[PDB]
Design a protein around this ligand. Structure first.
Ligand code: HEM
Ligand code: HEM
Ligand code: HEM
Ligand SMILES: CC(=O)Nc1cc2cccnc2c2ncccc12
Ligand SMILES: CC(=O)Nc1cc2cccnc2c2ncccc12
Ligand SMILES: CC(=O)Nc1cc2cccnc2c2ncccc12
Ligand code: NI
Ligand code: NI
Ligand code: NI
Ligand code: NI
Ligand code: NI
Ligand code: NI
Lengths: 106, 106, 106
């Protein structure tokens, strides 16, 4: 999907995590987010359209999704053990990564 | 499989490697060990049950199977080249990675 | 496929790229090259037959294909955006990595 569609998936699903009751719900939402971050990593953002793929910008752009995925995995690990509240508090910490890339490239 | 079962798999097949006649026997046994190592890496050990996935402890545990798997691959390469005695020796060097992790987490 | 077959493939498609009209041909060629590099990374070159899979030499051999594959990925990206001329320029810089390996290990 488009960079746009993937970001939607990230955004809506972060909302789903915040108001989840059980860990299955957090797990499912974290799994959809993981898929969409891997896919958003393949897109060229409008701001970078002039840059070759080995430039520091493009590489730092793909690095942003490497971190986010790493963080989603942490939250996934917690959801899998039924630890709902620490998995939610793990997902909160994704935002810093979201905002930071947006400061740079959005 | 869980941790205990996986460690049994590691142990028994290391013993097969010691007794092995040909490269095929070694190769087969290393493959099983590879898979058991990758499976055990997914588990939380009892000593670390209370630990965050982000822990220095959980990461150093996960890393121990990363070292182990890389060593298996070294031994796997030699088994593939028909080199039994050098595959056998490569597997004897696994032992130290066994011992270091058990010292911390067993 | 042995080393020779994979290198033949590497050589052939590099030419295809050089005389190509459009991005599709370049992309098709680069996709065949990538498969060949990954497959050649599995081979023990005749010069390093005695060498341990642990060797600085063997490790350095594997690393060469890692660089080649990354450079092919750079070139794939460009052909995908439909930037023929600049994908071709990216493919021209591959020869650096071909030659450096040949001087050592061929
Ligand atoms: C879970 C964390 C994230 C959330 C909730 C999120 C959410 C969003 C939302 C709602 C948009 C606007 C969608 C639109 O109006 O089309 C957006 C756009 C964007 N995001 Fe994120 N995002 C996250 C992570 C990231 C990261 C880590 C990066 C950097 C690699 C990134 C890069 C971008 C870019 C470049 C745009 C602009 C899209 C465009 O205008 O074409 N996002 N994001
Ligand atoms: C090939 C090398 C290895 C061998 C031969 C080996 C063998 C064993 C054996 C025989 C046990 C007996 C306990 C049981 O029956 O469950 C065991 C347990 C255990 N092993 Fe290993 N192991 C190896 C590598 C590792 C590594 C690298 C780690 C850590 C990264 C590790 C972590 C553990 C832990 C945490 C236990 C105790 C689990 C529990 O309390 O249920 N092992 N292993
Ligand atoms: C696109 C880049 C490359 C091209 C076009 C290329 C091309 C070739 C060609 C045409 C041969 C001779 C085949 C024959 O025997 O007739 C060859 C041999 C060889 N190349 Fe490459 N090569 C490339 C990259 C590499 C890399 C990255 C490495 C190692 C990291 C490497 C290592 C070798 C070795 C070891 C041989 C000797 C094969 C043998 O004697 O059996 N090459 N190469
Ligand atoms: C250093 C890095 O990750 N660069 C790249 C960054 C990229 C960012 C978005 C889309 N593609 C790429 C890309 N594609 C092929 C090769 C490299 C890249
Ligand atoms: C740094 C690291 O490897 N941490 C982890 C360590 C882990 C150790 C056992 C089981 N799972 C994990 C884990 N799971 C998801 C995300 C991270 C980890
Ligand atoms: C660092 C590295 O990639 N060394 C190796 C380099 C290799 C080069 C050709 C074929 N196999 C290997 C290999 N196989 C198993 C384990 C390690 C290697
Ligand atoms: Ni897509
Ligand atoms: Ni985990
Ligand atoms: Ni299991
Ligand atoms: Ni190998
Ligand atoms: Ni082959
Ligand atoms: Ni790309």
């Amino acid at each position: 999907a488009d960079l746009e569609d993937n970001m939607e998936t990230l955004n809506d699903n972060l909302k789903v995590i915040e108001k989840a009751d059980n860990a299955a719900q957090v797990k499912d939402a974290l799994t959809k987010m993981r898929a969409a971050a891997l896919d958003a990593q393949k897109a060229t953002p409008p701001k970078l359209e002039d840059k070759s793929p080995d430039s520091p910008e493009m590489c730092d752009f793909a690095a942003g999704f490497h971190i986010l995925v790493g963080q989603i995995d942490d939250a996934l690990h917690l959801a899998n053990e039924g630890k709902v509240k620490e998995a939610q508090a793990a997902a909160e910490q994704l935002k810093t990564t979201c905002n930071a890339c947006h400061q740079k490239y959005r």
